[PDB]
Each structure stands twice: as C-alpha cells, then as structure tokens.
Amino acid sequence: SAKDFSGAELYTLEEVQYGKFEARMKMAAASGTVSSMFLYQNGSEIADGRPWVEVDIEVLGKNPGSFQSNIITGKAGAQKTSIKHHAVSPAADQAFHTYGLEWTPNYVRWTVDGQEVRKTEGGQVSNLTGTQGLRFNLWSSESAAWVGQFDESKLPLFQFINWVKVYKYTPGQGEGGSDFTLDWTDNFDTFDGSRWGKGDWTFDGNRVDLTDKNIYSRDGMLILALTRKGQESFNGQVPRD
Ligand SMILES: [Ca+2]
Ligand SMILES: [Cs+]
C-alpha cells in the first residue's frame, strides 16, 4: 500500500472451464516491465492444497518483439512449467495485435492475429482441472535479472485493450466446424464492473501496487497504466487501431 508506483490487474469476475479468449491490444514496453494475458484459477496460489492452474502469454518490456507461452500446473512448491518463446511482428508495443488462448480438455493453443504459434496436446493440459478466469496485468519486477534494469525515465506507460471476446467450448459447433461459439464481446466503451474486477494488491517482487485507479475506459479503449502514484490518468491521444 506504500510503493511509489502503481500498476494494473484486470480480471473477469467469473471463471469458466474451457473456451476461447481473444484480446485486441497494444502493449506497453520498457526495460523492467511485464504484462501478460492469462487464464488463471483463482486461489491456485494458496499453499493450502489445490493444484496450481494457469496459462500465460507474457511480454517482457525489455524485448517487445517477443513473448513467452507457459502452462503452470501442479501446486505451489512443485509446479510443472513449460516456457516457450515466440516472435511478434511488429513488436508488441508498436502495433495492435489479436492475442488468443484456447483451452479444451485435450489441448491448449496460442494464437496471434489468428495464426498459431503453439499448441500443446495432452500432458500438462490434463492437469488444467476446474475453472480459470481471464486476466491481464501490467507491472514492473524487482528481479532486474529477469526483466532488466528498471527504466524509470520511461514512465508513464500505457497498454491499450480495444476489445475482448470470450467463446464457449462447443466441440464441432461453431463456424467451419470449429470448437467454439462466441459468448460475449466487450468493446470497452465503459468499464463494466458487472463483468470485470480490478486488483488492489501487490507482492514481494513487485515494484508496484496494483490499484483500481490503473484501469479505465478512454475513447472506446480500456487503458492499463504503469505510472508513479497519482499520475495514473493518461494525457494525449489514444492510439488508433
Ligand atoms: Ca473498443
Ligand atoms: Cs517519459
């Protein structure tokens, strides 16, 4: 509650089991920063039992021309991971891109602008038990070894989310016999608190406090902000998509 910088974490109030998730966005990048789009079983992090369930897309500000895919299963203190690296062109902070995650009982699939960059079948996928919510966050890590020196002269930084679409898993049903049917679309003309929640917390390793001030709708785009506390409001024009 006392750090000098603020960041963001947006999360769907409801979690689901299987589905397709798409977010049209332009990311923020700078040495030290981290932003991800990820499926997440809330409570996975609580040492008291329960498996860890998570699927990530993560962009490290020091190299916006690339991102990592990952599946984390197991349980805190014995989690299995599968970090892979992928290229993005143009760099995630120079243009809008459609990032997609697909999760069925048999495979997890990652896509950018509707093109596949990874598909995992079986294995860890089998241990993605229960539900997961859809999350997006923007922060800075203290581990310079992982994210790079924290380039403070670069703040304020802003990520822009134009829209999100969430589809249900309907094996065979859906266009061209695909496995998903559109459930809902959020074009972000407003922050819909009946659908989304904003984090208000932090952790050891996070140079920033995630606060509800760092997420807000502006000109038809959702904005996630990384800035000095009190400086969360964007000035200037929203990038066009
Ligand atoms: Ca929009
Ligand atoms: Cs600046």
From Swiss-Prot:
What EC number(s) has UniProt assigned to this enzyme? Answer: 3.2.1.73
Q: Which GO terms describe its biological process?
A: carbohydrate metabolic process
**Family from the record:** Belongs to the glycosyl hydrolase 16 family.
Which residues act catalytically here? 54 (nucleophile), 58 (proton donor)
GO molecular function of the protein, one example? licheninase activity
- Protein name as it appears in the record: Beta-glucanase
Which keywords accompany this UniProt record? Glycosidase, Hydrolase, Repeat, Signal
Per the record, what are the reactions this protein catalyses?
Answer: Hydrolysis of (1->4)-beta-D-glucosidic linkages in beta-D-glucans containing (1->3)- and (1->4)-bonds
Has keyword Repeat?
yes
Task: Pinpoint the GH16 domain residues.
Answer: 3-172
